[PDB]
Amino acid sequence: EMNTKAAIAEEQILNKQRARRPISPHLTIYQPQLTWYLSSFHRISLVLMGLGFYLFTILFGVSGLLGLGLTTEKVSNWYHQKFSKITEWSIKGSFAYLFAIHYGGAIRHLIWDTAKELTLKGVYRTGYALIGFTAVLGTYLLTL
Amino acid sequence: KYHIIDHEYDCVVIGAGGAGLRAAFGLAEAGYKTACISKLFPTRSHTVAAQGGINAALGNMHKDNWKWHMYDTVKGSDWLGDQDSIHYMTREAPKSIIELEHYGVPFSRTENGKIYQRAFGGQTKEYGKGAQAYRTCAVADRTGHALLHTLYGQALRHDTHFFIEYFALDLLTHNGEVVGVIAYNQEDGTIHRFRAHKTIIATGGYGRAYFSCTSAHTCTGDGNAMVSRAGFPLQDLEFVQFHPSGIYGSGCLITEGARGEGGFLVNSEGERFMERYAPTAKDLACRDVVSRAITMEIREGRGVGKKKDHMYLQLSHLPPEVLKERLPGISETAAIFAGVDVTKEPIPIIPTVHYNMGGIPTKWNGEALTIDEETGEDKVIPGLMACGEAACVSVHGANRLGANSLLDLVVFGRAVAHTVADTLQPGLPHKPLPSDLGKESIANLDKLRNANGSRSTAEIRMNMKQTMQKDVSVFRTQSSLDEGVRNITAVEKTFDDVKTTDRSMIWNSDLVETLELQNLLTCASQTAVSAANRKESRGAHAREDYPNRDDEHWMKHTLSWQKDVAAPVTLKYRRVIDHTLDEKECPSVPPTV
Amino acid sequence: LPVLPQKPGGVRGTPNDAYVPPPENKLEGSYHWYMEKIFALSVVPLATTAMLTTGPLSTAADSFFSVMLLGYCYMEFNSCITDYISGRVYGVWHKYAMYMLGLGSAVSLFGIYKLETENDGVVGLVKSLWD
Amino acid sequence: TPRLKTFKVYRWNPDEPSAKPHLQSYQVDLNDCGPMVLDALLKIKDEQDSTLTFRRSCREGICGSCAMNIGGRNTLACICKIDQNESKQLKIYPLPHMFIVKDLVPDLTNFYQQYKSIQPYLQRSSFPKDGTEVLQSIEDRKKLDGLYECILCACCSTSCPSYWWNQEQYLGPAVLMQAYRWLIDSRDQATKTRKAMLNNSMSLYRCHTIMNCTRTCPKGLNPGLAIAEIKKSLAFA
Ligand SMILES: *Cc1cc2c(cc1C)nc1c(=O)[nH]c(=O)nc-1n2C[C@H](O)[C@H](O)[C@H](O)COP(=O)(O)OP(=O)(O)OC[C@H]1O[C@@H](n2cnc3c(N)ncnc32)[C@H](O)[C@@H]1O
Ligand SMILES: CCCCCCCC/C=C\CCCCCCCC(=O)OC[C@H](COP(=O)(O)OCCN)OC(=O)CCCCCCC/C=C/CCCCCCCC
Ligand SMILES: COC1=C(OC)C(=O)C(CC=C(C)C)=C(C)C1=O
Numbered sequence A: 001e002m003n004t005k006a007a008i009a010e011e012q013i014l015n016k017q018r019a020r021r022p023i024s025p026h027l028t029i030y031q032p033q034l035t036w037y038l039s040s041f042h043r044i045s046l047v048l049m050g051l052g053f054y055l056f057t058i059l060f061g062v063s064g065l066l067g068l069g070l071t072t073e074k075v076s077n078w079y080h081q082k083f084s085k086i087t088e089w090s091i092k093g094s095f096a097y098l099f100a101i102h103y104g105g106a107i108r109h110l111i112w113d114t115a116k117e118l119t120l121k122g123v124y125r126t127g128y129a130l131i132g133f134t135a136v137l138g139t140y141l142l143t144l
Numbered sequence B: 001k002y003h004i005i006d007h008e009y010d011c012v013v014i015g016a017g018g019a020g021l022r023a024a025f026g027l028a029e030a031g032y033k034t035a036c037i038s039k040l041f042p043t044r045s046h047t048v049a050a051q052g053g054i055n056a057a058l059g060n061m062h063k064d065n066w067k068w069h070m071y072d073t074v075k076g077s078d079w080l081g082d083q084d085s086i087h088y089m090t091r092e093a094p095k096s097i098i099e100l101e102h103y104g105v106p107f108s109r110t111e112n113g114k115i116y117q118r119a120f121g122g123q124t125k126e127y128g129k130g131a132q133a134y135r136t137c138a139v140a141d142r143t144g145h146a147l148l149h150t151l152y153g154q155a156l157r158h159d160t161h162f163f164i165e166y167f168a169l170d171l172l173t174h175n176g177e178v179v180g181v182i183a184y185n186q187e188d189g190t191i192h193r194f195r196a197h198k199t200i201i202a203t204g205g206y207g208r209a210y211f212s213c214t215s216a217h218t219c220t221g222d223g224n225a226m227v228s229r230a231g232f233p234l235q236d237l238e239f240v241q242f243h244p245s246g247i248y249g250s251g252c253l254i255t256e257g258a259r260g261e262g263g264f265l266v267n268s269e270g271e272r273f274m275e276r277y278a279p280t281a282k283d284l285a286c287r288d289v290v291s292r293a294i295t296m297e298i299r300e301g302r303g304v305g306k307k308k309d310h311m312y313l314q315l316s317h318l319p320p321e322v323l324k325e326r327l328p329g330i331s332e333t334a335a336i337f338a339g340v341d342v343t344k345e346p347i348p349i350i351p352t353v354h355y356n357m358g359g360i361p362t363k364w365n366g367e368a369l370t371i372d373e374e375t376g377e378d379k380v381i382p383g384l385m386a387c388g389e390a391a392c393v394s395v396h397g398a399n400r401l402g403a404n405s406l407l408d409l410v411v412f413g414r415a416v417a418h419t420v421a422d423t424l425q426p427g428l429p430h431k432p433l434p435s436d437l438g439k440e441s442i443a444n445l446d447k448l449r450n451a452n453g454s455r456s457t458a459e460i461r462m463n464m465k466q467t468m469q470k471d472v473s474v475f476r477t478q479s480s481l482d483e484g485v486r487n488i489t490a491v492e493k494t495f496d497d498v499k500t501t502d503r504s505m506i507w508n509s510d511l512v513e514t515l516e517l518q519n520l521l522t523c524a525s526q527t528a529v530s531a532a533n534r535k536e537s538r539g540a541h542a543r544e545d546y547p548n549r550d551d552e553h554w555m556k557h558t559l560s561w562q563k564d565v566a567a568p569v570t571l572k573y574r575r576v577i578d579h580t581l582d583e584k585e586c587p588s589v590p591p592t593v
Numbered sequence C: 001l002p003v004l005p006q007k008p009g010g011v012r013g014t015p016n017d018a019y020v021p022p023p024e025n026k027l028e029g030s031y032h033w034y035m036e037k038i039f040a041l042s043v044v045p046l047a048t049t050a051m052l053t054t055g056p057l058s059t060a061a062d063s064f065f066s067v068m069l070l071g072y073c074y075m076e077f078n079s080c081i082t083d084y085i086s087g088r089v090y091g092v093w094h095k096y097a098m099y100m101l102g103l104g105s106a107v108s109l110f111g112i113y114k115l116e117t118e119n120d121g122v123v124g125l126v127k128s129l130w131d
Numbered sequence D: 001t002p003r004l005k006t007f008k009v010y011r012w013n014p015d016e017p018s019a020k021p022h023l024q025s026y027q028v029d030l031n032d033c034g035p036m037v038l039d040a041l042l043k044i045k046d047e048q049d050s051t052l053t054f055r056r057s058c059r060e061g062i063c064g065s066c067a068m069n070i071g072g073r074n075t076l077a078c079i080c081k082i083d084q085n086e087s088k089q090l091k092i093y094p095l096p097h098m099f100i101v102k103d104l105v106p107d108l109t110n111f112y113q114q115y116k117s118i119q120p121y122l123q124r125s126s127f128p129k130d131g132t133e134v135l136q137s138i139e140d141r142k143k144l145d146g147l148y149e150c151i152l153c154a155c156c157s158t159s160c161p162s163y164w165w166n167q168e169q170y171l172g173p174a175v176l177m178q179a180y181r182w183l184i185d186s187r188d189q190a191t192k193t194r195k196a197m198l199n200n201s202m203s204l205y206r207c208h209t210i211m212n213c214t215r216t217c218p219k220g221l222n223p224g225l226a227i228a229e230i231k232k233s234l235a236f237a
């Protein structure tokens, strides 16, 4: 029955050619813009910070099931050796800026879901008010 | 050699423009199996680039009678329009734009919830003796844009079998009647034989035969060459329209509504064109008066511009409220290809080719026409119809009014769907035909694919384009037109040694551009010979050696035959129709000056 | 990770074979958007009033903080599963990686119980690693 | 005296599919050229290598066929102007993360199947009796400004990272603005059916607000604010 044996005879010639097609490049050619860099940092910072929140609560959670008796001073003193004093400031310094760019980013992402400041002038003026706010509060936690 | 896939449908439609889409869900709604074969995606055609309106005698700015709208169509056509097709388009104009808004076209609205109408040029109320009337019924400057995006969405509601990105090569014929088309798929390179009962051609006009035009790149003549290659005539091919306003160099079009609400043609001296050399005492006339006004201004000595071929259109006099609400898309398309804004300084203007009123000779009800070679009387072609800009119903005649060609697609694309349902019964076995139907269209695809010659296909396309800009122009005599038929014949004899460098079949965009050139030489070599056999001057066809309209000898359209390229063209004539559908509803108008 | 057989070229069929949408499942639709915007409207005030307080934070001022930080970090990792370990391309290993945020994170709520009772909250552990 | 600018165009050929895709270098004279990029791609195909295939129809920027990735950003070639500096080269690419067909021609087939699934037509169930049009006020006509004039070029969809991975399920920014165009149409009284095919896991809630959408739109529209109002209307029901 034509228009039915004419459709299966079309998919056979086409699916053979659709499997030899390549994918055009997506990363490593696109222009680095402010709308994506400052919203890819927002997920990298929460993943690295959230992994530490999970790694320190399972370690205090497997000690309750399997009785080992871990306190804060039992694990704070262990972290204070095994690393150099330069290396500790590399962890204390990087985790402060990743907290500052996510604390300001979560206030940026709350005005955005109430349909406010989503034009192209409101995206670029609250991205400079997030980069500058990051350097203020990021250094503020290294002194304190 | 190849492999050919066979389909079976009740009706096939070539083209997915504003006319082939309206004819597609008119038949799929009535209970048929339609197939809309297209070369581009449907909302990528040429009717997306219209910044005008669609005329309707709705009468929501003032009182309006339809019969007033009939009088401006036939008077502005120099009495060559068939008044039984002027009567049908104009009477069914209010019924067909209210129905167009029930599909979901967002129109500009007025202070009570009614459709907003503005003024174009050529249309006046009280039977041509009165003030200018408002019958345009438009979105702001996306009237053609919002027309495709609504007609394509309504064609997804009913089952219309789109075959997107197919190049339709020829027609299939069997003893004087047609049975369907043979198309070439671009995505994988298979030839398709569509068998049909009625086939409809809505493939748009040809503008790319000329050097600088306002048409698209894909706006070649592809249905007018499929018809004449089968032995059927083409009608009124000598009447091409030259727009008064177009961007210098490239050919982009600023809107007809730029001179609609405030617009001044400014020469080198800076005076409005009302009198003293070219025009009549009214500004914004039809596009044969004001386009013959400009091309004779730069020739006599009033040379504005840089190389003394230019014009200015003033727009600083308007308020800035008009330049954002009523027309925002003209503010941007003049500051890119020219590089000048629309609020302080005038933009460049050059007359270029706009519209083509020639095509398939067609009745008022959509059926195509031919003539009997012994009696000279009309005779329909069985199984073939036409609509749109590739069809000459002669609702425009020799000069097309503003905003009347978007009403051609909606009305006469709808009348096509009514004269199939009153003529065919859904579903009826197809005739057994030979196994080699469409074999001369495969060997013509297999000849241009393996081309080995001297001249490339973009070198013959420049010899054709510059010849028809020199001879067949706004001012022509019978000493340059006799040369123009002699130079367009010397070009067509060099198509036999074309060169093609791409031997693939998946997206061969070099085989298509040399198949769009074979299609364009057939419609170009008939525009040249049939313009050199009209010894009068009416409409957009002006002759400097015969400058008087001849309403006693030359009240007839022409009919041009040409089987292939480098073949002799013969001409015959048919009488215009000067009586309406019902003489009791409206009377037929008599020809005046 | 085992990959299911995919569609040959991204698509299947003609352009006029429309996409068939999944049924309305507003528990993981409109109701999932609430729990992200509730857990984010109750962390940024409680992290603001945890940097202006010099000492540790109260017991009841940390058990609200330690629970709203769990769901805010759980809805974040739920978005990195659906985007990357998806069901079109990995199949049953979308559910197996979604159960490791189950009984691999419900015992991270018992770890809160070892911090609100025997120690001084989670704000006392991160202020004493000296950040 | 000529001035030569060097172009670099992404090339593939489906007749010999075993070879990898690569960049080919062409030398375009800038003196006898046009200002735009499509005036320099059409100049190559006439006076040079003529197997270079691409899509073009109107040269104006109103249809949407010439959408490619010129210089990093997604734009239309009819309008993207060539920088008149011969020392700097230009790189042209197809739309990112798309299965290309021949050279610069991406398979936009999944983009047309998703546009059909949002039902882009009016679904009114009652019309006036006198035979005139259905009423709509002027202030309810300004709701559609900025939405009804999208040209379906898919430069916004193939700039979204969350559409690069999940494009077989997530509708993308170009299609979801064309569902918001019918949602706030005041004469479209069937609106509960439209806000029920978006209420699943991956049709609308894969947007994260990485607004490349609004950034790269050549017509100046805003498909990132339009997604944030479908979520705002799916909640307060
Ligand atoms: C060019 C133009 C026209 C225009 C205008 C402004 C410009 C720049 N402004 C107008 C205005 O203000 N008012 C008005 O009334 N008209 C105006 N126009 C004219 C109007 O746009 C045309 O009359 C109209 O566009 C004609 O539409 P039609 O449907 O007749 O033709 P199309 O839009 O070109 O569509 C053709 C379709 O057919 C397909 N095709 C072509 N060749 C083939 C082959 N060989 N095989 C298969 N399909 C084919 C095309 O791809 C398209 O789909
Ligand atoms: C289970 C615990 C492990 C949590 C994960 C491991 C560490 C990662 C925590 C976040 C990354 C680094 C942020 C930590 C910086 C904040 C702590 C700090 O800066 O120390 C000083 C600073 C001030 O000390 P004062 O005594 O008041 O006065 C200064 C001395 N005169 O301490 C504070 O009180 C800052 C308040 C703590 C802020 C963060 C607390 C919660 C962090 C847990 C993980 C967060 C996950 C997601 C949070 C982001 C939400 C937007
Ligand atoms: C949230 O926004 C983004 C993503 O979401 C789909 C990504 O996966 C990626 C790719 C992966 C990472 C983490 C950069 C990009 C580029 C991005 O910005």
Ligand code: SF4
Binding pocket: D150, D151, D152, D153, D154, D155, D156, D157, D173, D174, D177, D216, D217, D218, D219, D220, D221, D222, D223
């Ligand atoms: S929203 Fe803009 S970029 Fe996206 S398809 Fe429409 S016009 Fe193109």
Ligand code: F3S
Binding pocket: D159, D160, D161, D162, D163, D172, D173, D206, D207, D208, D209, D210, D211, D212, D213, D214, D223, D224, D227
């Ligand atoms: S770029 Fe994509 S991720 Fe969302 S904000 Fe726009 S649809």
Ligand code: FES
Binding pocket: D056, D057, D058, D059, D060, D061, D062, D063, D064, D065, D066, D067, D076, D077, D078, D079
């Ligand atoms: S061709 Fe219309 S935008 Fe490039």
